[PDB]
Design a protein around this ligand. Structure first.
Ligand SMILES: [Cl-]
Ligand SMILES: [Cl-]
Ligand SMILES: [Cl-]
Length: 232
């Protein structure tokens, strides 16, 4: 299921059952995004990630999400984005510099060895929502799908998480992510804020932020299970 399905089929057929219910308020908006993508292709433009990966962050169970990591837009280099914020496919070398920064801090914070590859799927399988606010991008055109309708989709997702009584930690990287604080404050959600891991900002405070260990300390305090951050 790709673009065709996103334009034409119910949420139940696109994402995990809990997510499908959570995203029901934006069912028409999702369909409209599928049409936007169809129009892009008809016009002789491409988009990233692959259609089958666009909604991938919502294919893991809504009820198990305990940490939210927000990204802005997918990687713009062809072949990098795979539908989970910051993740890349296992064969990708070198890693994008933002991911290399995230992994630098992972090693410093947790003491684990540097990951073998850039695939963050294990995090998604273990209750981390790796959510870009904008879920597609035109190749090599950073932030080119901003303002095209994804924002309402991804905001609906975040509000559904925040509305729950269940524990949530939100890792908020950069000023744009920090815009989410109001919706997060009225819930059972603690936000960890730092500069973004992009090389443009990382050295102003991303390094040293220890988000992984902090998120776990917060979770355990709230009686939730921590995340097993360990990557192979
Ligand atoms: Cl189609
Ligand atoms: Cl293109
Ligand atoms: Cl991405």
């Amino acid at each position: 299921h790709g673009m065709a399905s996103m334009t034409a089929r119910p949420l139940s057929e696109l994402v995990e059952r809990g997510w499908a219910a959570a995203l029901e308020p934006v069912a028409d908006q999702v369909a409209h995004m599928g049409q936007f993508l169809r129009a892009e292709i008809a016009a002789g433009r491409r988009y990233l990630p692959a259609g089958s990966n666009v909604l991938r962050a919502f294919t893991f169970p809504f009820d198990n999400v305990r940490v939210l990591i927000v990204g802005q837009d997918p990687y713009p280099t062809p072949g990098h984005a795979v539908g989970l914020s910051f993740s890349v496919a296992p064969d990708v070398r070198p890693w994008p510099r933002s991911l290399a920064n995230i992994f630098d801090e992972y090693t410093a914070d947790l003491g684990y060895p540097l990951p073998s590859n850039g695939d963050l799927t294990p995090w998604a399988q273990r209750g981390v929502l790796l959510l870009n606010r904008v879920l597609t991008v035109r190749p090599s055109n950073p932030a080119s799908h901003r303002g095209k309708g994804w924002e309402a989709v991804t905001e609906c997702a975040i509000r559904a998480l925040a509305a729950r009584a269940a524990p949530l930690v939100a890792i908020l990287w950069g000023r744009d992510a920090s815009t989410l604080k109001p919706m997060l404050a009225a819930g059972n959600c603690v936000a960890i804020e730092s500069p973004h891991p992009s090389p443009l900002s990382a050295s102003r405070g991303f390094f040293g932020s220890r988000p992984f260990s902090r998120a776990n300390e917060l979770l355990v305090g709230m009686g939730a299970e921590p995340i097993d951050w360990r990557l192979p």
